[model samples]
Target chain A: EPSPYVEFDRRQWRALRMSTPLALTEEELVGLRGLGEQIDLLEVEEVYLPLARLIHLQVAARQRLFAATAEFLGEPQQNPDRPVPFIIGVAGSVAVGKSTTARVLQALLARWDHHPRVDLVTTDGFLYPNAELQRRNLMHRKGFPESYNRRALMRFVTSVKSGSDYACAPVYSHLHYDIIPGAEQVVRHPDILILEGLNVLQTGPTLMVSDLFDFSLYVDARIEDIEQWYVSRFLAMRTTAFADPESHFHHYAAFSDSQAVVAAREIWRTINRPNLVENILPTRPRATLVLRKDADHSINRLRLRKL
Target chain B: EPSPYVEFDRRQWRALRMSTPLALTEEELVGLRGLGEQIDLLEVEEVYLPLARLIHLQVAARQRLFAATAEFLGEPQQNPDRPVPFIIGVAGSVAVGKSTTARVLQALLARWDHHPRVDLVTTDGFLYPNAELQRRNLMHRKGFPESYNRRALMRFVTSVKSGSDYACAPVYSHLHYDIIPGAEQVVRHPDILILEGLNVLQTGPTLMVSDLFDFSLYVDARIEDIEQWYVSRFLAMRTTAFADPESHFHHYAAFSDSQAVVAAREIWRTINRPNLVENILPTRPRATLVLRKDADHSINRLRLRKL
Candidate 1:
């Protein structure tokens, strides 16, 4: 068991130097504006670089210890033929910027000494297409674990761990709000795999599909902050992202400004918020590591295991 | 990709080995006297050994590819800080001998060239204790995947893949016919793992859990043979295993031979058979491998993917 690596507070996090490299270049920052600014050498050096370095250290050490322990137990020596895979899970409520966190990590991790070919997997890809969910009468629970292809998800993870040279996951289109037909994400061999979902941490204790998370993360924030962010994002989407004719949500772009605000507020209050409290929030404590966010949208502190 | 593995038939299978190599060797067999001296070594060798070897190949290959993929995707390499696990699912019907098959494979797979720490996990461990199911009005529908703890099962699978070195699963006692509270079967790390359940293969096509299976096995037999095996096993249980005073089914032990046979026949016809036809057998095609059995309780053939 390793000692507690660090208990990061916002102040210390702000002051730390990044010990890791950066994978996302400046051009990629254009779309990520506010989020990308945090990806500089400073943030990476101070916040994520150290984190990645530490993680690599941990994985290596753990693997060593695992091998030794297996040997001590008189277990069979490592098979000359099989591969052991490491799977990490990232889970959180929408609007918490977990996606940004995941994206940043994926990019930066590619620069890590250990895992240079990181592959990112989102539970969004595991979600069934809208028509299928509707057919199964599970449209209302789309983000819930029950709504995802649990067996397929399991198989993908298992296959990756079992060393499939290439794995293909279904692609999901948020703009179209359904599974894209025939579109797939092909993941060639990589050293790291990140699985992101709103409820990846939900236990499928009920024999339902929700119980398959490997290593989970909950992108959390103060409820009020998330509410505000949700509404603001909704407002922004009305004109900028939603007005595209191909957008499935384009009809909502025509709402009057005031109507849109009211609608967004209502939607947030009625659906996302409650779902977060009832479903997502409960999963926070279950995480092996928790990344807590404050009102400013930056991580407040990191609560990791002390093994 | 490899050529499809061939399937074996019962007559030839009757020549294979299916003996236990445990400390209480022959103890379980003693209790299973009805199994007869007819246990087949050839069946064990041709059917289970090949399956185990395939899994061994998958397990070894998965380690490097999984690690590479995860690292390339960028997040944190599953560091010593976290140990992600590999999971396998084996699903089949009541009289299909999946349980026996899983146990035999568990023993055989322990011989993996690398991972000798093999663990055998059964879905029965996740089933709500009989009392809870009875309270929830689901006692009769017990074997359905929904009847078990989906969340717990999901967490268990996820945690193993997530790499918890000291993972433990709940233990279930057939005598009590429920998960034994507080008695956990700890699985440190195995080179290969086998998760056995009736519907381990049943799930919506798009569900992630369905995809989670690294390699899946479905044990199949003709319905008539299955029904006969079910009755025979039931009769066996009534006369031998169920006669124990501690057995929850002790009441049936006191019944006259004809009465017990009739009761066994009724249970098979009414409950187990329907579950087999409706929920279990339908999943045969989905398996990565299918072990076809004969009336004499021998695996007649093996069907693997045409890799």
Candidate 2:
């Protein structure tokens, strides 16, 4: 594929962060960080702070184009008081810290006066419940693209695009490892909506999931690092969330750390690794910006498509 | 059903036409004009001149993006002498004068110093032959989306997008009303390429025909107007091209004008009209710009998508 992007190392990119005020603190960063992820004020200030500012610029550009088009047609722009939300898609492989990135962006962007409203809608909520996946024999490939309810995901984003005052997204429970029946997340009119998922950037047989995005970010890390992270997180969860009798992975809680690591490696090799290689990583070029993280989970480089 | 465009009447839109040079003479216009369509220099100047200028601007924007992307990638941009072709798609119902519009743009755009090399390729050549349609009992639905060899069309355009120095498109004969076997049009690398067809904008069960377009134009008219034009054009062709023994429509040449009108109207009502309504018209909003024609086949209004 012909790429239309520029690559910048960490130091070069940090210099461009220039006067963007950091809205996140170390205390808040801890809450936003994922189970196997490590993030701090410095990381948020250097990495996510610049991303929020860049996204703000993109939103402004879209507004300018909307106003110019309205003027060209001699027609009044609709719903001036509540402009449509600018959707940002964050896509990456499993255990790439995409959810953490989405949450950080949501919190930071909402802090800006220009955009007081921001919402995060993860694709996890759109995945099919365990019953459906089991019925379809897709339990082994749970995080694969086909395991998700693609049509429902498309409909939810369509509702967001329709400039509705309120929309609802289905909720998923990580502990249960399935969609929560009848549970929903209400999304009010927001200036920004961040959609994060492993296969969020995949363009399938029809209209693409990424087509609705104004901007997209792909969280990147080496496969070995991602595998290690996944295994480590799986072990951590075994002692914590997985220990609950009601948890789907409660059986794993009785296993030793070594046994858990072996199970984690087997699942990653059989499921997540193939899913990443076949579906997720291939969509990296489709992203507007790529945040390449180091082994330590700090973003060390940025690649952005030239406008 | 939701519209993301603003409408402009003829007078209001014409006001935006700044000075742009015209390239085609009356003699050239006559040859390029489709049957029963009246396109003189005045109409070209009034309607198509501004469109050509706008497309030129869009092409320049694409080139600028290409250059910027190359710069960021730290790779030397291809062919510093000329950039890759900026693809533009033109779509609408059969007998809606989309071919004339595409030809006019191709002629006018090639005149510019910035992009002197321009090529026009129609999707007609990518259609299944009469034998295949007959075998499938789809003769009556010839102009419908299914009658076309969509895979071939996709491949041809994909090759063009790959920026190859040379590409071959199958040759289609309107007089014979079929694809010319073993014939091809060798298209050298051009600064601009315009793809025109009835179903060019259709996003069917796969990747869309319009996905690769930098800009798209939809030649639109009331279904009533389009039906009348189709029938009128059918009658005109009976006396002209259809009179030849080799013409696929030669059988219709024996009919009297009155009889031909009835037959033509029936064909239009049965075949062309449904295709327009069910397939073509739905893709209208997918275009970047829509040229809405009046009863006289003159564009009386324009609708552009909000950027």
Candidate 3:
């Protein structure tokens, strides 16, 4: 029998020689250009990739079981005969780079097995349109549990897990802040699916639906480091991506850099930070694996439970 | 050529010396008092057990693939790890027995050879409590997609798929028509997780949350038959279960049988039927396999796509 929990000691990693390889590959280094000179691809290739691979295989196996069960019930599949959808869950507090982790995993997994059918779906797509949020007077609580359509989400998971030959998902437009009425991403039995989001570790009661998942991952970072990153990312986006004319965040770009920084800090302190403390960080022990990040946003250690 | 979908038809059954065994031994069956009788244990044991065995094997194989890939990436896990949670999605119309199906699968999968730690979670646990529904005037459209918190639901699925060792989902009270304020369902990493729901199939232009499933089952029956079942079940509940003082549906017990029948009919025709036709049924083709039921509530026929 194996213990189901995994933990790590940061001090031990700190003792490792600095020359110890930073997790990275050549292509990732090339891609990390302007983000920061200090960041390395090694963090992704060595750290997140391993985690993603575990999930990819885990979900694949579960799907196979579903298909076999269906056959046992006297129903055999026809085309792309796999009945289970590969599921990957990514969790981290705001500024922990969960999105980046999810993206890297998606890219790496796709390339790993030459699987062209890899699809990445973020929880953002399921967000209710901004109008509805405002209508429900829940705009202030956006991204909080109370503001979501949990039943629809569970149903979506249910359908996908059914190994539907063709599965579809709702689209969420971040810029427009709404669930686009007719937009759907159809999944035709993808070899892998990467799902990432903030505060995703919660498993609680529902009035409308139930729980469905294949695998989950949580990214780790110290609270102080995360707060700093949140502030820094906010500042960086203000001038770069946030400056685009069509960007919903364009207004922030016009603000003085210092002003933007203040706003970022305030928002982080008031909402994102609290959310991390109250919801996301508490789930660390719950993860099958935890990827610990250092001050520079690089994965310093990985902890995985023994089964 | 046959379709690429992985489904088994009746002919396939003839090819394989497959058995549809009940999942529950009589001892286990004695404990599940509330779940309706439609959940056949023999089928689960002979049928679902073999299916789960297949899943266990597939999941093991997938884990091996992941471990190999991870090693290829130069990070073999030091300890042999348990497989990630296998997500199964159960879908069908109301009164189609998906709930029972989920319950039965949960228990049966747990009893399987490889996955004794199997767990079941439903989408119904996430519904907004009745107070919130009434506050939003959404009580009439409670089960519709518009009635849920998509973001929260997405977060929950995302967490599960990420391979979290411990996950919690909010609970919903069917008796009260609202979410329990503080109650949550704790989910440890399971070898398998079954998610059941009605509209789990709908996917618009964005992400259909169901795209995350490893396996999915759509419990289908004729719309007319479902309506009949709805009325009959309602009458039966009204006379027996609803009569209990603890039941939220206790008021229905006082109604004449015909009155209760009319109420059930009205709900089915006005809300559930339209939703099913417009949102749910369109997703049927997307399922990996479909279980077609007859008027008698037995799984008379099964459809398996040629993989």
DockQ-better candidate, 2 vs 3: 2
Output the number of the TM-score-best candidate: 2
lDDT of 2 by residue, A145-220 (tens): 8999998887777677657777788999988888898899998877778899989888643444576787899999
Identify the runs in model 1 with alpha carbons over 4 angstroms from their true place: A1-19, A23-30, A33-43, A50-92, A109-218, A222-224, A236-260, A269-292, A301-307, B1-38, B52-92, B106-224, B236-262, B273-292, B300-307
For candidate 2, lDDT tens digit of each residue in B1-307?
2334567787777766677777788898888887778788988887787777666656654565555435433456767556767889999988899888998888888778765778999988877888998999897887788888887777677667657677888888987888898999887877788999988887632444566677899999988888888888888888799989999889999998899999998888788888888888877766888999999998989987653
Interface RMSD, every prediction, one decimal place: 12.7, 6.3, 11.7
Per-residue C-alpha lDDT of model 3 across residues B1-307, encoded as one tens digit per residue: 2232454443443334344344467667656534344545544543345445554545554455445434433454625455556667778777778876677667766665544676777778767667777898988877777777765665676566556777788898776657888999998766677777777765532334575565677888899988888888888887577878878778899999889888999999888888788766876765655777678766645554322
- Native contacts recovered, each model: 0.00, 0.05, 0.04
Q: What count of clashes does model 3 give?
A: 132
For residue A136, give model 1's deviation from the true position in Å: 11
CA lDDT of each candidate?
Answer: 0.64, 0.80, 0.64
> In model 1 chain B, which range of ten residues has the least summed lDDT?
B15-24
Ranked by TM-score, the better of candidates 2 and 3 is 2
Q: Is the docking of candidate 1 incorrect, acceptable, medium or high quality?
A: incorrect
Q: What is the Cα-based lDDT of residue A68 in candidate 2? A: 46
Provide the lowest-lDDT 10-residue window in model 1 chain A.
Answer: A205-214
Please give each candidate's TM-score.
0.58, 0.67, 0.52
Candidate with best DockQ: 2
